[PDB]
Scaffold this active site. Structure first.
Site, PDB file in Angstrom:
ATOM      1  N   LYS A  60     -59.352   0.314 -60.734  1.00  0.00           N
ATOM      2  CA  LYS A  60     -60.149  -0.391 -61.485  1.00  0.00           C
ATOM      3  C   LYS A  60     -60.573   0.252 -62.932  1.00  0.00           C
ATOM      4  O   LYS A  60     -61.100  -0.546 -63.642  1.00  0.00           O
ATOM      5  CB  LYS A  60     -61.231  -0.854 -60.052  1.00  0.00           C
ATOM      6  CG  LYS A  60     -62.384  -1.599 -60.160  1.00  0.00           C
ATOM      7  CD  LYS A  60     -63.452  -1.077 -60.594  1.00  0.00           C
ATOM      8  CE  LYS A  60     -64.221  -3.054 -59.835  1.00  0.00           C
ATOM      9  NZ  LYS A  60     -65.696  -2.247 -60.126  1.00  0.00           N
ATOM     10  N   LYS A  72     -55.385  -4.101 -54.006  1.00  0.00           N
ATOM     11  CA  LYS A  72     -53.544  -4.369 -53.486  1.00  0.00           C
ATOM     12  C   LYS A  72     -53.500  -3.056 -54.683  1.00  0.00           C
ATOM     13  O   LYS A  72     -52.537  -2.118 -53.850  1.00  0.00           O
ATOM     14  CB  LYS A  72     -52.895  -4.568 -54.446  1.00  0.00           C
ATOM     15  CG  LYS A  72     -52.661  -6.388 -54.135  1.00  0.00           C
ATOM     16  CD  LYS A  72     -52.007  -7.589 -54.348  1.00  0.00           C
ATOM     17  CE  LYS A  72     -50.901  -8.156 -53.298  1.00  0.00           C
ATOM     18  NZ  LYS A  72     -50.317  -9.447 -54.048  1.00  0.00           N
TER      19      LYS A  72
END
Length: 87
Positions: A60, A72
């Protein structure tokens, strides 16, 4: 291929292969452009990353990855296998 040689230590070559593959399925399809940039951008930073993503957070923090695609990634570093459990 002259100048473009394969990667000696395949670090994130298995992830990008699943994000770049389905990514084509997003643009190749008609109503699938939102998910397109999802793996197209996430696969770009990962496929061109100089390190390996430890946890989903490391995916992220990358520029271009959001919480959906990055989520994911955490499942990848978490266990690795992805059964067909839809619940």
């Amino acid at each position: 291929m002259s100048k473009r040689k394969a990667p000696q230590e395949t670090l994130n070559g298995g992830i990008t292969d699943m994000l770049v593959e389905l990514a084509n399925f997003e643009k190749n399809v008609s109503q699938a452009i939102h998910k397109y940039n999802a793996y197209r951008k996430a696969a770009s930073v990962i496929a061109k990353y100089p390190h390996k993503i430890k946890s989903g957070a490391e995916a992220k923090k990358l520029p271009g990855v959001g919480t959906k695609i990055a989520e994911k990634i955490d499942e990848f570093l978490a266990t690795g296998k992805l059964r067909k459990l839809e619940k």
